[PDB]
């Protein structure tokens, strides 16, 4: 949730500045944890 927030909240970066949405953030955290 925090990763999603810090990545997509700012309107001065947006089309989206990155791919770190909520669904992708969960995937990133999972992959990170699972090594």
């Amino acid at each position: 949730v925090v990763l999603f927030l810090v990545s997509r909240f700012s309107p001065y970066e947006w089309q989206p500045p990155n791919e770190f949405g909520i669904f992708n953030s969960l995937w990133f955290s999972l992959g990170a944890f699972m090594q």
Partner: protein, 193 residues
């Protein structure tokens, strides 16, 4: 209109669950004592009858026994790192800070309709909810990390009412961040045209 209802409902649910967790005494099922020392009464001389109990954050109580329902006030400081941890578990600042942040969250959602042009109020709501969940995490760790400095235990529904509140709060925080993103995406399209 339809995505704000889930946010409003979720914020109320999370605040309610975290106020009932902090207020109720069903955080732990231990086997200790719930009555003060019976010096003269000599009911058990000194060490009373250890029976099944249900503890919370402020009061310990007794399920079974002749004193069923008597609730003593948990004494944290008995007799640096250990002292600081005992001052954070006694005050329960983090379980109570979450409540204050969950309450502030909903206030922002309330203010998000009397001022429909200040888009920075919906962002504040989301930050309060995410931060509230963070405080819940710390509170849970602090609570668990304290009960291990003292000795067949289970967790009650008031422990899972704060754990559930964290999940609800984090999900609402996502919905309030998405609404902020959506709000700002509706002001660019118009300006592009």
């Amino acid at each position: 209109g339809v995505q704000m209802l889930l946010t409003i409902v979720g914020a109320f649910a999370a605040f309610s669950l975290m106020t009932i967790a902090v207020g109720t005494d069903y955080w732990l099922y231990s086997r200790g004592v719930c009555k003060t020392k019976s010096v003269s009464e000599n009911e058990t001389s000194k060490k009373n009858e250890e029976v099944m109990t249900h503890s919370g954050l402020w009061r310990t109580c007794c399920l079974e026994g002749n004193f069923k329902g008597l609730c003593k006030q948990i004494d944290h400081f008995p007799e640096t790192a250990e002292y600081f941890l005992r001052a954070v578990r006694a005050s329960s600042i983090f379980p109570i800070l979450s409540v204050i942040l969950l309450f502030m969250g909903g206030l922002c959602i309330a203010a998000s309709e009397f001022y429909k042009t200040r888009h920075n109020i919906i962002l504040s709501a989301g930050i309060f909810f995410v931060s509230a969940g963070l405080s819940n995490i710390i509170g849970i760790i602090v609570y668990i990390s304290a009960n291990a400095g003292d000795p067949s235990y289970s967790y009650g529904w008031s422990f899972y009412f704060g754990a559930l509140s964290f999940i609800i709060a984090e999900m609402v925080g996502v919905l309030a961040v998405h609404m902020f993103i959506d709000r700002h995406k509706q002001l660019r399209a118009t300006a592009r045209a």
